[PDB]
């Protein structure tokens, strides 16, 4: 299938090449499979979402998406326009409070929660979490995160967006776990983007325009941003056969655009998310 005039991000991770503005996709689009984006909630009411997004639990007074984040995170994962998996079915967490800051004790709820969650839903191709999140490191949000892949989801977080080494942030220094960083629309490693050993897979995090509260729009910039699009990726791919959840993150790696970013230190790597999608 084709979009055109897609958002940056989307043609990027279908083109070997930046600067185009198709996304080119296997139809299936992630049909079968669910991705819980943990988060702010997600404004399942919507259009941009069809009916595919549910919230299915928050810590807070509300379910409501009352920041914008988490919407714009699900938008990017599966919205009909923004999204890299335009079929999949998206699951609200609200962890953030409307401010968009959680404490680590209700986080690590969260994460247990969708380990357990997915058991009560029908994800036949498998099951993904999408984490725009993180604080300072803790060993303790790294095993929560850790315990949420090991059950069986595709977990993606965001590298973090403080230009410094990932390995002092949690969930993104998690080994186990998909760490993702920020790519410009010009191929560059994002000016905000956390690096280091730790990340695994590089998305398209400036300037991204996703779904957003009061069903609006708005672009935004983040690893936050970056991380939706390696969790639609990997429903995408789960739901085409290619790669489960235990694997995609490494699958995502080794299909990635390689080499094709500036700006990425020594010791990180250079890899950008990619469909490889062929008519």
């Not at 083109?15 to 996304?23: D, E, I, L, Q, V």
């Not at 938008?75 to 079915?89: L, P």
């Not at 069986?152 to 080494?165: F, K, Q, W």
């Not at 998690?174 to 994002?190: K, L, N």
Request: overall charge neutral; proline content about 3%; charged content about 15%.
């Amino acid at each position: 299938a084709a979009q055109t005039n897609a958002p940056w991000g989307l043609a990027r991770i279908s083109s070997t090449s930046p600067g185009t503005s198709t996304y080119y996709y296997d139809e299936s689009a992630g049909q079968g499979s669910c991705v819980y984006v943990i988060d702010t909630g997600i404004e399942a009411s919507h259009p941009e979402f069809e009916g595919r997004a549910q919230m299915v639990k928050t810590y807070y007074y509300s379910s409501r998406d009352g920041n914008g984040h988490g919407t714009h995170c699900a938008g990017t994962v599966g919205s009909r326009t923004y999204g890299v998996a335009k079929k999949t079915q998206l699951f609200g967490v609200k962890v953030l409070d409307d401010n968009g800051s959680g404490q680590y004790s209700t986080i690590i709820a969260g994460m247990d929660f969708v380990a357990s969650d997915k058991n009560n839903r029908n994800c036949p191709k498998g099951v993904v979490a999408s984490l725009s999140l993180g604080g300072g490191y803790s060993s303790s949000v790294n095993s929560a995160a850790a315990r949420l892949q090991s059950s069986g989801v595709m977990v993606a977080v965001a590298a973090g967006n403080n230009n410094a080494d990932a390995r002092n942030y949690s969930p993104a220094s998690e080994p186990s776990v998909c760490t993702v960083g920020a790519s410009d629309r010009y191929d560059r490693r994002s000016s905000f983007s956390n690096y280091g050993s730790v990340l695994d897979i590089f998305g398209p995090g400036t300037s991204i325009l996703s779904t957003w509260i009061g069903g609006s729009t708005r672009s935004i910039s983040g690893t936050s941003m970056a991380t939706p699009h390696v969790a639609g990726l990997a429903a995408y791919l789960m739901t085409l056969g290619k790669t489960t959840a235990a694997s995609a993150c490494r699958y995502i790696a080794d299909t990635a655009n390689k080499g094709d970013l500036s700006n990425i230190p020594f010791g990180t790597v250079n890899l950008l998310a990619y469909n490889n999608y062929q008519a």
